[PDB]
Amino acid sequence: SVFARLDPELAAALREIPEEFLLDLRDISLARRRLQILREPPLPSDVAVTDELAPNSFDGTMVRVRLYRPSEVTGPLPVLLWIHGGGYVMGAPEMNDQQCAELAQRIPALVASVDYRLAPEHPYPAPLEDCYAALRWVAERAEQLGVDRERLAIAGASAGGGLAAGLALLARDRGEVPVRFQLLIYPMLDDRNQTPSSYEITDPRLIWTRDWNLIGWRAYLGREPGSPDVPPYAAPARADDLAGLPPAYVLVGTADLFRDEDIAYAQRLMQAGVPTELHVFAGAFHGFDVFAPTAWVSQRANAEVLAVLQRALKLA
Amino acid sequence: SVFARLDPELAAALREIPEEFLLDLRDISLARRRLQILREALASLLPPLPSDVAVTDELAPNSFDGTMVRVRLYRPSEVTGPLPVLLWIHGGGYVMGAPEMNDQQCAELAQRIPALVASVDYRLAPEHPYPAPLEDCYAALRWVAERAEQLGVDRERLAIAGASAGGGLAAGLALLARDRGEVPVRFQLLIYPMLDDRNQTPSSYEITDPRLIWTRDWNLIGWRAYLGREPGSPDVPPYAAPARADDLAGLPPAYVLVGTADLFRDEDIAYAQRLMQAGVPTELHVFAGAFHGFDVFAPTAWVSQRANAEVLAVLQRALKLA
């Protein structure tokens, strides 16, 4: 009944999750250590996984970038900068090792996954400047990394899709690093929590609720959600001028808190002349693609993300 | 340049069409000829209709005015048990087209879903304005449901579908069928539907060159013919222009497809999002750099193949036995 608006296969996947495994953002610290304990087929043997460090001139820190290199392939590689989710307050690149290694192999591409700092300890702009530092490092060291600087895509899921959208705006405005494509998977990109869908999801059995969203945005901004003059890099839904952004793909489910902000952002990209594909999946919840990967709709989503990245990052 | 916003493979397809083959809606008889010529150019490049699909014509009674509506049936031979049914409604801006224009698409859907496909020969504007064309589709829907046990079809697996003007008629038919409460509809498949007469969305101003198939001016002429009133007039019924419908709750689950370079981009996105907000399960797919009719004008393009494969996959899933 909490599951009533879901694709029946997705409802069945969500029913098999024990109540004690669901997110509780009362205590960020517990939710994290509980999540990392939770997580723990092995990774492809033709993908080399290494950790590198990128200088961040924001505060002079070093950002860890986890690289996934397809060992088989020859010639220079396109690159996918991947940004993980977790509501700006949790997650690590390791949570997406499986997906990143699969994309490295199948695109094929060098996948560079950003170990960005978390809120509330490191609010905006720190986590986005971490992503920008990673992007700048890939671009600058392209020949050393054996990548084509002109085939640089950025991608993220949820909070990571918000960071990816804000990275596209920030990269465009700074005029240093060209970005070929942006792949936004159910991006968390509107702090205001005023869309119809932002009121529709309140039960923690649906993964990401309005209550979790308010806590995540409050931590990330260090300001109340919907505060005046939140920078467009922090909450891309607020960005007025979207002209000259990279070609985009946006995916979201109809049973996602972010349905309405994701549709509005994709439509505004289109109205600013940015080439944009938008796919809204019927009865799909937040994280359906990774929490229920055997569902017919999840397989369609995962096959499509691969197909659009193959096409976008393909040599001319 | 006119083709600047298009996927390069789609721009290549449109560059190949001679200027003299394009639609001119300022003369409806000329437009019907231009479409016959385009229809021949497209069909030229396609294989023959499958041999295992029987194509026949039947008549459905229309109690609106007592006329009979031709319904063109596409029956896959290799399936002897109960079939789902797809009611197909062709495009043509409410002023042109015939079911024969989609013989290839309907025969392939009948074979591949598989389903009985029933294609509506609705009357055209301006000779037969709203509501006649929609009541023709309603008469066809009612006939399929009533005759189901002799057609050998499952009336609990009845989908309605259309392209462009046919997608407007399909959306209007879902509303009319919901409100009359006689015939349950499992699914509505709307391909770049023409469903807002008001022409006030940003995308409705973006396409003015006839080389991009459907322009603002063609849209205003089509709507004017269909309504028998100026487009954007007050009180246009929601059945005639579904974008105007206030309450979308209880409509059949939906699939909506449109390209970013379609006049209908913004009305299609808005209709799909309003379905989702009314609790109707809805899939929306907007294809980057795709023009109006990209799926039939440029079927070999990568984006066209993805669109055609997805329409099939979605219908197979919506119409399969539980």
One-letter amino acid of A83: I
Q: Could you list the active site residues of A?
A: 158, 256, 286
Q: What is the separation, in whole angstroms, between the first and last Cα of chain B?
A: 49
Contact B290, B236 (CB under 8 A): no
What does B13-56 look like in DSSP terms, one character per residue? HHHTS-GGGS--TTSHHHHHHHHHHHHHHHHHTSPPPPTTEEEE
Query: Residue A42, Cβ neighbours under 10 Å: how many?
Result: 6
The three-state secondary structure class of A216 is helix
* Distance separating alpha carbons of residues B182 and B188, to the nearest angstrom: 17
CA angle B30/B34/B37 to nearest 5° reads 140
The question of whether B292 is a catalytic residue gets the answer: yes
Q: Cβ of B5 and A273 within 8 Å? A: yes
In our burial notation (b when 16+ CB lie closer than 10 A, e otherwise), range A180-200 reads: bbbbbbbbbbbbebebebbeb
Please tell me chain B's helix, strand, coil percentages from 3-state DSSP, rounded to the nearest 5.
Answer: 40, 20, 40
CA distance B319 to B312: 11
* Cβ neighbours of residue B179 closer than 8 Å, sequence gap 6 or more: none
- Which of B7, B266, B268, B292 is an active site residue? B292
Structure tokens at B5: 């916003």
Residues B89 and B36 sit within 8 Å (Cβ to Cβ): no
Rounded to whole angstroms, the Cα distance separating A269 from A289 reads 24
φ and ψ at A224, to 5 degrees?
A: -65, 140
Residue A164 and residue A277: Cα distance in Å, rounded? 16
Hey, what are B131's tokens? 């509501």
Question: Does the annotation flag B222 for ligand binding?
Answer: no
- What is the Cα–Cα distance from B205 to B211, expressed in whole angstroms? 15
Task: Scan for tokens 């891309």, then name that residue.
Answer: A236
Contacts of B259 (CB under 8 A, 6+ apart): B192, B265, B286, B287, B288, B289, B290, B291, B292, B294
Non-local CB neighbours of A59 within 8 Å, separated by 6+ positions:
A126, A129
Helices B165-180 and B132-146: crossing angle in degrees, nearest 10, is 60
B279: left (phi over 0), alpha (psi -120 to 50) or beta: left
Question: Cβ neighbours of residue A45 under 8 Å, at least 6 residues apart?
Answer: none
User: How far is the C-alpha of B4 from the C-alpha of B19, rounded, in Å?
Assistant: 18
> B79, B151 in Cβ contact below 8 A?
no
d(CA B102, CA A217): 50
B288 and A266 in contact by Cβ < 8 A?
no
- C-beta separation of B118 from B155 below 8 A: no
φ, ψ for residue B257 (rounded to 5)? Answer: -125, 140
Q: Check B288 against A247: CB less than 8 A apart.
A: yes
Gaps in chain A following residue numbers (C to N > 2.5 A)? 40
> 3-class SS at A126?
helix
B168 labelled binding-site residue: no
A154 with A83: CB under 8 angstroms? Answer: yes
- Evaluate whether B34 touches B22 at the Cβ level (below 8 Å): yes
Which residue out of A259, A278, A314 would a mutagenesis test of the B interface target, given it has the greatest number of B Cβ atoms within 10 Å? A278
Sketch the domain layout of chain A as residue ranges. 1-316
In chain A, what's the furthest Cα-to-Cα distance? 54
CB B294 within 8 Å of CB B303: yes
Give the helix ranges, DSSP H, for chain A.
8-15, 28-39, 97-106, 126-140, 142-145, 159-174, 197-200, 210-221, 259-271, 288-291, 296-313
On chain A, the residues whose CB falls within 8 A of the CB of B266 are 267, 271
Work out the number of other CB atoms within 10 angstroms of the CB of residue B223: 29
Q: Are A131 and A124 in contact (CB under 8 A)?
A: no
Cβ contact A24:A30 at 8 Å: yes
The C-alpha angle with vertex B58 and arms to B57 and B64, in degrees rounded to 5, equals 130
Q: How was this structure determined?
A: X-ray
> In the structure encoding, which two tokens stand for residue A36, read together?
């990392």
Distance between A219 CA and the closest CA of chain B, angstroms: 29
Asked whether residue B285 is marked as a ligand-binding residue, the answer is no
* Core vs surface per residue B31-44: b (16+ CB within 10 A) or e: bbebbeebbeeeee
Question: Mind spelling out the 3-state secondary structure of A224-277?
Answer: CCCCCCCCCCCCHHHCCCCCCCCCEEEEEEEECCCHHHHHHHHHHHHHCCCCEE
| Distance separating the N- and C-terminal Cα atoms of chain A | 50
A121 contacts: CB under 8 Å, gap ≥ 6: none
Rounded to whole angstroms, the Cα distance separating A302 from A279 reads 12
CA-nearest residue to A316 within chain B is B8
Distance CA B13, CA A54 (A): 45
Three state DSSP letters for A137-157: HHHHCHHHHCEEEEEEEEEEE
Q: A-chain residues within 8 Å CB-CB of B253?
A: 282
Question: What's the sign of the alpha-carbon dihedral B247, B252, B253, B257?
Answer: negative
Instruction: Decide if A279 and B277 are in contact by the 8 Å CB cutoff.
Output: no
In angstroms, what is the resolution?
2.0
The region that residue A87 occupies, defined by phi over 0 for left and psi between -120 and 50 for alpha, beta otherwise, is left
